């Protein structure tokens, strides 16, 4: 109940929304259920939780400080605003984002990588990322773990989750609900905070 007492944890969740024209947009889909589930469990563990969310149909848990955004750019600005004052950042979006160049046949431009940015300006914070691949899961998750300067990468297929920690340890899980996975993740984070 007090496992993460006083720990500031920032979580990103949901999809990003990129405009094409005033009445059209594209969506890099991400459910948001996982992020919102982690946020709820984190609160119950006594953590100070900040949730940066894209457009979802979900309602944030009580006591969760939530910022609703749409674009990947706004999500970036929101995370940077809090990054100095947090202990843990959990990026719950395995999808790399793309964005149209104009706001009026559709030219796409590269968006700024959130996890890469946080890794470059990282001080003492812990970076947790996600990954969802159908091939070379271990190789990709490990590559992302080292490239983005992260502490743990959560790999996906109710969920079947394998976690890859920075120290080299690998933890596979059976079929669990999102809330169960959330607990296992926050358990791992709790330990990394003690290692420091």
**Is the alpha carbon torsion for 180, 2, 152, 92 positive or negative?**
positive
Is beta strand 98-100 parallel, antiparallel or unpaired with respect to 108-110? Answer: antiparallel
- Residue 159 annotated as catalytic: no
Q: How was this structure determined?
A: X-ray
DSSP structural state of residue 61: P
CB burial of residue 159 (10 Å; 0-12, 13-18, 19+): middle
1-196 CATH: 3.40.50.10300
Q: What is the DSSP string of 38-58?
A: HHHHHHHTT-EEEEEE-S-SP
144 is in an annotated binding site: yes
CB atoms within 10 A of CB 64: 19
Q: What is the DSSP string of 92-118?
A: ---SPPEEES------EEEPPPHHHHH
Are 30 and 129 spatial neighbours (Cβ–Cβ below 8 Å)? no
Is beta strand 48-53 parallel, antiparallel or unpaired with respect to 170-176? Answer: unpaired
CA distance linking residue 33 with residue 56, whole number of Å: 9
Choice among 2, 28, 149, 151 that is catalytic:
28
Segments making up each domain of the chain, as ranges: 1-196
148 is in an annotated binding site: yes
């Amino acid at each position: 109940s007090n496992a993460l007492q006083g720990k500031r944890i920032l979580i990103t969740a949901g999809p990003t929304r990129e405009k094409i024209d005033p009445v059209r947009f594209m969506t890099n889909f991400s459910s948001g259920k996982m992020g919102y589930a982690i946020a709820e469990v984190a609160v119950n563990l006594g953590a100070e939780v900040i949730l940066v969310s894209g457009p979802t149909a979900l309602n944030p848990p009580l006591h969760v400080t939530t910022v609703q955004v749409e674009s990947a750019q706004d999500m970036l600005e929101a995370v940077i605003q809090h990054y100095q004052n947090v202990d843990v950042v959990i990026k719950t979006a395995a999808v790399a984002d793309y964005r149209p160049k104009y706001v009026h046949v559709i030219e796409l431009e590269r968006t700024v990588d959130i996890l890469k940015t946080l890794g470059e300006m990282k001080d003492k914070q812990l970076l947790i990322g996600f990954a969802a691949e159908t091939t070379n899961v271990e190789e990709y998750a490990t590559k992302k773990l080292r490239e983005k300067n992260a502490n743990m990468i959560v790999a996906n297929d109710t969920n079947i989750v394998t976690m890859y920690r920075k120290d080299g340890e690998v933890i596979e899980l059976p079929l669990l609900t999102k809330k169960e996975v959330a607990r296992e993740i926050l358990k791992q984070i709790e330990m990394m905070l003690e290692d420091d």
